[PDB]
Amino acid sequence: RSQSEREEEWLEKLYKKHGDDYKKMFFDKKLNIYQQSEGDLKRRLLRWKKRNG
Amino acid sequence: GYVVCDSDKRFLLLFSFLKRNQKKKIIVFLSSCNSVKYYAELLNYIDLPVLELHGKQKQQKRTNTFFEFCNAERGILICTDVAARGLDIPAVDWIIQFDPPDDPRDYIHRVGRGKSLMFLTPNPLNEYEFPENKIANVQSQLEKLIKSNYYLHQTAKDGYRSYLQAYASHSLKTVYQIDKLDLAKVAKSYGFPV
Amino acid sequence: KVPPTIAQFQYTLDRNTAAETFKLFNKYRPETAAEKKERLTKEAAAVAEGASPKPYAVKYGLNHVVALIENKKAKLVLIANDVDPIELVVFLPALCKKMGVPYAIVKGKARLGTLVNQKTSAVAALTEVRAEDEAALAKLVSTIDANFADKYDEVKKHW
Amino acid sequence: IDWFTRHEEVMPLTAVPEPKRRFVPSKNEAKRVMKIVRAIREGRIIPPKKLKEMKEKEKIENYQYDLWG
Amino acid sequence: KFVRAESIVAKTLATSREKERIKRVSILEDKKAKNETQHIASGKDFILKITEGLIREKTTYDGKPALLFIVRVRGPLAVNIPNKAFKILSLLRLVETNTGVFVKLTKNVYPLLKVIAPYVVIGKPSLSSIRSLIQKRGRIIYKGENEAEPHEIVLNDNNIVEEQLGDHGIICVEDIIHEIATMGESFSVCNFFLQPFKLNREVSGFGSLNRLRKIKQREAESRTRQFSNAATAPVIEVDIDSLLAKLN
Amino acid sequence: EYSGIIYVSRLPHGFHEKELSKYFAQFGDLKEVRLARNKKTGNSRHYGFLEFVNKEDAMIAQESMNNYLLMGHLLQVRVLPKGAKIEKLYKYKKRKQLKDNMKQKHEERIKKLAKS
């Protein structure tokens, strides 16, 4: 089970902007539109870091 | 000793007294450990560098970060009545208690080691004045902000549900549920009191 | 002979106030089936190749309105008088008076239908508003409370 | 006699939490777009800008054909 | 019939813009003509053209005499014209809506042209649009049988052209068009000879399509005509040629 | 009881005695009208008095215009008690010898820093 094209490209935007600051990442408004928790974003980034860098 | 204010602008006055006083080690005392999640989460998001202490976090997480205040010079923490009990720092000048305390009797005894004022609509030292048109107009900023994030809406809610429970679970005949809920919701800035 | 909670209707909002109510309400149309569909195809053509805030509209379901009053989220509530089962809406002016949400009985059910992309609506409400029309809305609230509520304080009485 | 309603209400009649679906921009329309993305990925549907281009080449070529021979 | 209170304030406040609008323009071109620049907005003549993506080429205006055809429009909403605009529109006798006239643009004409800008639309026409206007619409106020002159009726003849003007070399209706397209000396006499041009209105009806075509076209005026309301407002020029296809 | 002079208040900006006289002519014959204006600049303080000649006709108007929403804000209108006439709302519109004293005043002023 992989992730979608938009999801991957959206995660690229978050990683390049903040890095690994999940608190800043979920208090962000422009990139993290759907106000997901720290646990949601980091889990999806771990899956992203497996397929990519 | 105290400052007489209505329940609408109790929080709005506090944000004034923090912004005007940004050099001194000052402590607020609030009731609920749930509540000081809320007033900490606003002030870092309306950008005051505050600190936060409450029961809902770990011990050395509480301790080592409380340790940062004790060796500091400038800033400010927000803590409960309970978690700060027994651990007074002599390096402090303002103890403002927002709430009626847990024990009102034994509260005066814990002063004498630190200048004091409180906040009360109907409910030694003197008061202070306040020029009423000086409070910050952030309530326009906050009402948009309490509607936009849902995390800040949830923590506003628990900061309200837990505020009044503790207000009812108190000792005194004076501080018993007379206060109108139209204005305590405005201290957490709602349109409707949840 | 009519029991007072029936014929709390028919003592409806007058000519000029009703006109001004629709001057406000016709600004806040729900996006129609055609308009909504074409917008999403615009979104499909754009987002597939290469942000928006919450848009305000009127709220128009009977269940949705009876939710919104007592939520409390409703500010103005329009209520049609002509309803096939009258008992569907008889409690609604009392609910608004009890929760303190400003209401107005409007005349014509199809008149509500026009502003809402439906045949009939029976009830229509405006929960939230754009900032420019906020002062105008609150003025209409006072206008309706002066004309409708204060004139007909005795509407709960008299058969 | 409007007896009970004279005492005007304060908190809403429920206490239900309000979900995150009433804040971040909505899934439904976001799902619906993704389907219309899917259909143009499969090409079942033309975008509206090319439909004008389908109507630009068409509808000028009117009455411009032989009918007797 | 009864007047609603909405009306009389809307009429008040719109005209008391126009009473304020032309006052400022009448003060300005006074100070432009009398040449007392210590505090002015702008120091020259502006003519803007609006055509088609919706281009706005603002230009200067030299002294070169040009030819303008001006159509009366009925705008804006609640505006009783003041005394200062009753006059110019009566001196151009454009008191009927959807009625046109050719005039010449000089530096005497341009300052008064900023007065009537919200009430009409102006522009430079083409020779076809000069010609196809006159040979298709034309009124001649001339004597009837014996008594009744003011039957304005029709440019039927070329010998009625011999009758009134005649001695200025004015021999045929095509010769009139020479006197308008080219600035001739007897241009004002033949301009005084063809008093209106009763253009039709575009929408011209109530109905199914007619309600919709009115609404769809009414917003089109709001783009192709903007009301500047400025002290040194430009004079806005539209293409007459595309307009006359809508009006002939 | 109620008298003839009316208290039309809360008037829209851009609504003067003429339109006050014009619109309230529609109810019947009207005695005399003013509108209270600022003296310094000729603009309105948004309350004005008029009188009908018929005391019947007054409370016709008050029972028709007491909360009549009119381009922004509803007119509040009042019949008045007996007597208490319309009075005084005037129609206002937009309406080295020195060097001796300044040499005196320049030297007088320096005493003030010595004062405080």
Place this chain on the structure above:
Amino acid sequence: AIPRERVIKAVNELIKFTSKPEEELKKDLQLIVVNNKSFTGTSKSFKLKLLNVKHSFYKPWKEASATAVKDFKVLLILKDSDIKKVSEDDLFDQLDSEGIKVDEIICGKDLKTVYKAYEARNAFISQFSLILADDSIVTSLPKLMGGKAYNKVETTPISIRTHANKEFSLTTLTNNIKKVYMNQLPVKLPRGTTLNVHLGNLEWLRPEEFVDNVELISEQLIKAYQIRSIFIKTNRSPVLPLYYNQ
């Protein structure tokens, strides 16, 4: 030209008068009152004379507004062409490089539809302190943003050149906003003879720097205007005769 030493004896004796055992404005507001034989007597202007100043009092005003109660905020009024063109991120990228920060840019539209209420307009305007306005619409504003907003010297706008010879460019505004911010001081022009120059924050203006600001102003006033008398005044002090023309 005025002597440096009377101004030093002017400012420091007011440091005395401000060091005594509303207060946010009385202590803090260095102002200097200027008189004329009839400033601009017959025409009610609203322009702001942007007096060139060597050393800013706004980067000073930037800090102490964080320590005091009211937030110093900067407005830009634009026409329709630019707001559709330019974001705050482009401003922030080329002004935080100094450290100045446009809080809100506001269209000409927004003054008339979403702040058209007098209450909300006073709520919107009275927050801000540096009102800047693009030149195309500067001349339309007292219908828009009210007359009450022109009673102050903060809230009255400043015309600022944003067009690079007839066309807008961001480069033009970005160095011009710095030009008005750190180098310029406004003063209005009543048609009376009295005029003050609210010079600024007395907590700032290290009073050797303050004399540098005062003397530089007196250069740009005596050259541009005839003048009669000049006075420095902490807010309703005894007035101090600094300069005395005849």
Place this chain on the structure above:
RNA sequence: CCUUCUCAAACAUUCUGUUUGGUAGUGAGUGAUACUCUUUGGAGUUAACUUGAAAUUGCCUUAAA
């Protein structure tokens, strides 16, 4: 149920600077010592603050029916 002056010039250009001109207000009310003026009549001014857009009287036609 109207919707409000959305830039002119001049010189010099770095891909924009310098200079000049252009803005006549909702109303009410509070109020901090100074400035000028003429003449005792008050006039023009100068900080600041409040306020639901508040208020009880200063001597043209087709936007037709």
